[PDB]
RNA sequence: CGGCCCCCUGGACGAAGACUGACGCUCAGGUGCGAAAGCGUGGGGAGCAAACAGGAUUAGAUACCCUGGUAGUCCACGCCGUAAACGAUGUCGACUUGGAGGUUGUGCCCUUGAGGCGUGGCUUCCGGAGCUAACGCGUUAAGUCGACCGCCUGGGGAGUAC
């Protein structure tokens, strides 16, 4: 996330840009992930579980949507 | 018999997929929903806003015929994509007509450049063009009487992404998105883009030849968090948006609307 | 009676998208144009005619017909159809156990009737404003629900339906009691509960109207006979 | 909306650095097939090419390193 | 004309904030001494009411059974849930050789002569159902002839 | 691997009956053909039709009376794992005579009743009801 | 795997027609050659278990083929086993 | 089983043809492969960390938390032969409504464009008939059948003793 302040650019704006860049990188997230050792099994489980959740969100909810709430 | 088989291939022969054949007769009007029947499986829920012309009031009663569009079938119940895009093809045909005699003539009136090219509006629709196209020379329509009457002489068109810059006054004078993503880049180039779907965090305005823009929720207005983008703008509408940010790598052009 | 050309014009031949189909409707389907299922009009028409005939026959023995269509697009039309041949109908949401649980619903009907009488024949007026309002609301509710079936008395001797998948509860009820069913059945719907299936476009308004009209005519004819 | 299907390329080239550069991050990372919309078959190839390039110092492993 | 036999009555509970709410289930079966049979399963806070309900249920949703004289037409198996049931036609005089719930259903049906074992579960409700199923499926000679496109003498 | 062709055929027939299939096709065999013929005679199927020279396909045409299927039950009895041979006195009665038992005898494949009449038993192929 | 040319050569020698390729004897020969080739590999790479599985399978197949040959036609089998030098 | 490269090497799938001509399926004993930990001999040892030590916490804390930390984890060659070694679902074959995908071929079609119409392999989810104690399974069956094998017979005692 290397950044250079442009000529006649505000500080705040620059900071914001930097933040955005960082977010894009996913650096903080990566750091968080590597704080502690995740057993392979655990890693697998999370990934599959997450996937399942995503699938549920996509399809079941869509089905629900077809019918009106009131 | 084979009467029906022949009738089927006949009816295949006498329809096409896009909004081309002006076939749907308006068979019920109620504000705010028009509805047609172009020989499809169901009737369209048409907005009223694909059919009022240039000052706000309706133009077509019962029996009237506009084609719509297609290639999308069944979201649960219903049939179409809107006929207003239909209209775009007609506009494209008129723009194309230029090529034949190297001069399309209508009226173009361009007061100012959102992103470096005066805006030209033809009939109901208004389009944005690159900065040169508005004036033949360095004349500049800022000194001209505001929203003046000329025509449009075309300066530049982008051929994939739809941006057309046209020539006001001077009658006498006569893979693919992502490599060179530096055209609308530089900090704040304003664009005219139709929104597609508003995902409760976003609005997804994306027009410039196979890209994706967001205008997510933070700008959109001059209130931050209580906004809910479906209330505040539209569905399917061409708006004020500019880039504010491009990543040509993780294709996220992050446009804005508070400008 | 009803011609093929007319049906075509209406938009009977159109069906639902291919992903929403029922494979029990594979006999009644002809093909798939632009990823949308086309109902076979050669197989539909005779069936339709048969159904009409049956309806007429029913009418002739003084049969009570019930017209069901709670789509909300063709709610106006079904009511009209019903009224033309002075028969009964359910154009708004079918009350779960209308027929199976008639004896309870008979009380509701009675109540509605009473309310109507109070409104009209009494001419008393002089009622507390909130109470009066409440009464009015109740009346409205009843009318919406059971307006068509208030003069039905008992159970109907046949049941005409505009969509089988949408009115499955009604259909099921009719099967439990054994009332003949005359359902319009699009490609997505299930024809197994239906006695006299009619393969046709439930969704399109003009088609629905057409379906109604012929039926009404046949009922009238039966009555005349 | 894959580029390589349309171009109809037999194999992605690590030497074709410019092309690669569209699919790499500002931070050097290879961009996901969700974002680019690259076809799966091609994506792997692209990745491989990028890796090769990195070995040959044609592309950088990361923005920071020096 | 209809005969009606309450097979079983069972007390069933529902736990609530206070304690246990008790109720009674009545399994009955009714028949006209000919083909027609129907079981009913009724439930109420008091027994008699429950029984009545069951009877009412039974009286509607009856079912016809083809009976060659006093007995069945051929050996027939019937299953439902745990209860799997075998019943076999038998010579005049032998009586209903069958156990429990199964017997009752047979009696009302107007079978007089059967050899019938209930394998598996003998949960009255299930077993009666099984019996009913068995009876229902059982086809006659005439019916079979009709099915096959033959006369009765061709089948024997 | 395919170990019992007759059994397979029977299974196919059953499935057809279940699924309301008009006709059921399979690779032809002489025994199979005979069985089909027998069935036809006894009136459980409409017609059978063998077709082909190199690898011929037997096609049975299933029967449906009043909606439901005709072949109510159809089980193999003899099977490669465990063969069943009956003497003319020990020959069974399927559904107390209402169904049939296909039995292969020295004088060709026939229904159980036929076999009895002849005065000979044999390998019991299948019960059909 | 066995190189194309080698395979062709093998086919030509053992196969009667040379276009045949599927002759039992020919197949056996092909198998045998492959086995021979793989011996060298496996001397080097003793822990390559996965690869060895394939070899084992091939061997089994060859054995089966031999057995088949034996019941059908003994003389031919004998000839084959002389040619290849298969102890059985 | 996961950076990249090379060498040796096993299987799978498709496309057409050509050939062989039942050579097949299953398999008690038998043979092999078999995570992690563990063992032996010789190397290696950054990080992590059973054991151990101290600091906390606590009524206690032979734990959880913290600071350290050795076997081990890594390599070579042997042994061990077990795991919720799981889809808690033996292998092989046949047959029985559908939908939405993913992946990897391949035939035709104006690829007029990212497409259009098929046809094969493997695969994720939903669901019909049927099945099931129900939960659920559902063309990758737990459906309808056949072939072979393995295994179960109340809980504990015990997968223990001899």
UniProtKB/TrEMBL annotation, chain A:
Disordered: region residues: 42-70
Biological processes per GO annotation: translation
InterPro entries, per the entry: Ribosomal_bS21, Ribosomal_bS21_CS, Ribosomal_bS21_sf
Composition skew (Basic residues), residue ranges: 45-58
GO molecular function, one term: structural constituent of ribosome
Sequence ranges of Basic and acidic residues compositional bias: 59-70
Pfam families named in the record: Ribosomal_S21 (PF01165)
GO CC terms in record: ribonucleoprotein complex; ribosome
UniProt keyword annotations, A-Z: Ribonucleoprotein, Ribosomal protein
Family classification: Belongs to the bacterial ribosomal protein bS21 family.
Name under which the protein is recorded: Small ribosomal subunit protein bS21
Organism: Escherichia coli (strain UMEA 3162-1)
Name of the encoding gene: rpsU
